[PDB]
Design a protein around this ligand. Structure first.
Ligand SMILES: CCCCCCCCCCCCCCCCCCCC(=O)O[C@H](COC(=O)CCCCCCCCCCCCCC)COP(=O)(O)OCCN
Ligand SMILES: CCCCCCCCCCCCCCCCCCCC(=O)O[C@H](COC(=O)CCCCCCCCCCCCCC)COP(=O)(O)OCCN
Ligand SMILES: [Fe+3]
Ligand SMILES: [Fe+3]
Lengths: 290, 290
């Protein structure tokens, strides 16, 4: 069969020939493209032995930084624009549906199940925010059996997993919308968010002259039987980082207003225990039938 | 700063513009080439959300499989031909030295320091082999203060790094050559080597219809003051896998003969405890001046 891999040209030709053995058509195509690009990158850059070693070390450290609650490989994808590119290709603003946005590294399915009026945030975790809307079809009809996975930074600038003690989740939950599609829950106003700088991605951003900021945002991931899954986020207006999100997640249609309500009776009705005032985020979620 | 990342074209243009912030000129060039290739790969393949997820999972698992005894990221580089391509670019044969070959995943930082006539292998680790030669410059000058880091599979087809109990290293050592460049040590005859399939790389080889075999080989990593470090391997002739090395390491100039020697006096002189026959591998190492 194949000649000894004596030269760069032969190494590439041999590896490309071996792609033929991949049985699955799609995986074969992906592998052909991967080899082509990997080999071109190495040849075009004349990657040094030391640069290769450093790359091995970085990728290893990236994987080793990952836990069930912090995905450093997602974060790497995010800061290099891969995550946003995949999102744009896969979820084109195609029907009248709420637009898609990046997941990011801090999603977990270890979040509490909640009914409407419950809170995703413990007390003393930031300025009160109430989030509400209806889950609707593009035809305007209510969507039953919808669940909203939602998560955010606390008002102090940290996701729950970035603290040393996590005895329970915080500033996240799985909210079950009602039969008429209505959802409503307590939360806190999210703050401009500095991406964690204590792993390989932080080092990459420093070495490449990048800031590490995301604008304020609230993740919204919605599923319902009969509808396409939406992964998205709302971005409160007026944040100085909206036009320079480090992970390219902001879209104009996902920028939202917050309205302040200073009515102690209303705050208590909504379940806020320390009363006073809250900011209101009212926005429907529009899903596309499957 | 930049327009909202609303489309795939804008995402890529924004990321490429941000590469300009990288201060180091070489790192800037590498990042720009990396972004270009990553983005092109995603667009050319229309990579799906699920395929992205699966890739994140694979890369994470690969990093988490890595230890001081097993470099799964090196193995991944190896099976995709990247390692061999880097080897060829960085040690072009025109310089006149011994050719490079793949490091592989089983180099360790704990090999014993040894002197000429010592063994890298405990008893009952395979058939006896003696390795010898002289370290020379391309210009002919003998090289003082050279060390030969050498490692190989045991005669059952496993590196010490694969053992559940590894109280000491085995079938590896750092042999200090003499002032005149001469080295000599006892070893075992290397056997055809099956790459362990219990990590991500094994799954990748299965999914892509590949075998997991390397021909018999003895790693040789030679360092000396005033010379370029050589990372190479000798490949005994006659092995059925030489023509289909899974990691593209074999080069005709690195294929060696082994002499069968039945000479009891010589066997004892060379330090073989049981005497009897041994295979002799005699090959000089030619290093390139800095
Ligand atoms: C098939 C499509 C593409 C194929 C062709 C391209 C692939 C080649 C693979 C990468 C090869 C070299 C990468 C170029 C490095 C440029 C980085 C310049 C800045 C710099 O040196 O930063 C340091 C090293 O970072 C680094 O070494 C960062 C490495 C980044 C690799 C990212 C690979 C893509 C993965 C992203 C996720 C995508 C998954 C879904 C596709 C930061 O570190 P330090 O030196 O300060 O500290 C020590 C480690 N902690
Ligand atoms: C440095 C760049 C880092 C990111 C890569 C840039 C481009 C992104 C590529 C994404 C798409 C992958 C393209 C090929 C398709 C996969 C191969 C087909 C076979 C297949 O699906 O294999 C499964 C998944 O493998 C896989 O998912 C294999 C992914 C391999 C990508 C590695 C690229 C880096 C090469 C290493 C070089 C080191 C740095 C030096 C420059 C085997 O797995 P399974 O399905 O059994 O279960 C795995 C969980 N364990
Ligand atoms: Fe977030
Ligand atoms: Fe080996």
């Amino acid at each position: 069969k194949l000649p000894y891999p004596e030269s760069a040209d032969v190494i590439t030709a041999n590896m490309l020939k071996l792609t033929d053995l991949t049985p699955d058509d799609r995986k074969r195509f992906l592998l052909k493209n991967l080899v082509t690009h990997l080999h071109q990158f190495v040849r075009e850059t004349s990657l040094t032995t030391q640069e290769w070693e450093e790359t091995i070390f970085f990728l290893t450290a990236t994987g080793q930084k990952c836990t069930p609650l912090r995905q450093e490989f997602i974060l790497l994808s995010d800061v290099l624009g891969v995550s946003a590119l995949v999102d744009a290709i896969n979820n084109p603003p195609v029907h009248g549906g709420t637009e898609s946005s990046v997941l990011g590294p801090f999603y977990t399915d270890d979040s509490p199940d909640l009914q409407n009026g419950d809170s995703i945030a413990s007390e003393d975790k930031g300025d009160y925010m109430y989030v509400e809307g209806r889950v609707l079809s593009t035809d305007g009809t209510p969507v039953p059996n919808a669940t909203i996975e939602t998560w955010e930074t606390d008002g102090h600038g940290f996701y729950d997993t970035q603290y040393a003690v996590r005895d329970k989740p915080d500033c996240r939950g799985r909210v079950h919308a009602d039969k008429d599609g209505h959802f409503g829950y307590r939360a806190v106003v999210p703050v401009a968010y500095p991406i964690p700088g204590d792993g390989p991605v932080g080092n990459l951003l420093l070495a490449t002259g990048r800031h590490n900021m995301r604008p304020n945002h609230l993740h919204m991931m919605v599923e319902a039987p009969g509808f396409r899954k939406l992964t998205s986020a709302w971005y409160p207006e007026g944040d100085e980082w909206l036009e320079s999100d480090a992970v390219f997640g902001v879209k104009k249609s996902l920028v939202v207003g917050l309205s302040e309500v200073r009515d102690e009776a209303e705050a208590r009705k909504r379940g806020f225990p320390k009363g006073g005032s809250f900011k209101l985020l009212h926005r429907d979620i529009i899903l596309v039938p499957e």
